[PDB]
């Protein structure tokens, strides 16, 4: 039943303006992310995240999710996954030098 079409972190194909408008919300907590379809990439996805600093405000970091033509995914040349979900779990409990461990998803 768990289909990537209705994932808790899968909105689908959205514009870039609305994307930054969803993570750049004073109500969104620092750590909110969202996986959508590759708008500028090809046959790939894009995991975005939200961050907050005590100097300027909250910014939005975009982490394009790569995809191995063999059948895998990875946003860095060191860890690989067999499903966009696995990549969201590892980065959800281990920033691994990311902007912030995933804590919430986009509503």
């Amino acid at each position: 039943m768990d289909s990537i079409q209705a994932e808790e972190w899968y909105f689908g194909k959205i514009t870039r303006r609305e994307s930054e408008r969803l993570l750049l919300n004073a109500e969104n907590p620092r750590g909110t992310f969202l996986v959508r379809e590759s708008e500028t990439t090809k046959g790939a996805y894009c995991l975005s995240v939200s961050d907050f600093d005590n100097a300027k405000g909250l910014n939005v970091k975009h982490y394009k999710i790569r995809k191995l033509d063999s059948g895998g995914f990875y946003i860095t040349s060191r860890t690989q996954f067999n499903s966009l979900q696995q990549l969201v779990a590892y980065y959800s409990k281990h920033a691994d030098g990311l902007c912030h461990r995933l804590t919430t998803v986009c509503p």
């Binding site: 060191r78 030098g97 902007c99």
Partner: peptide, 5 residues
């Protein structure tokens, strides 16, 4: 985009 380092 950013890079994991």
């Amino acid at each position: 985009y950013e890079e994991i380092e």
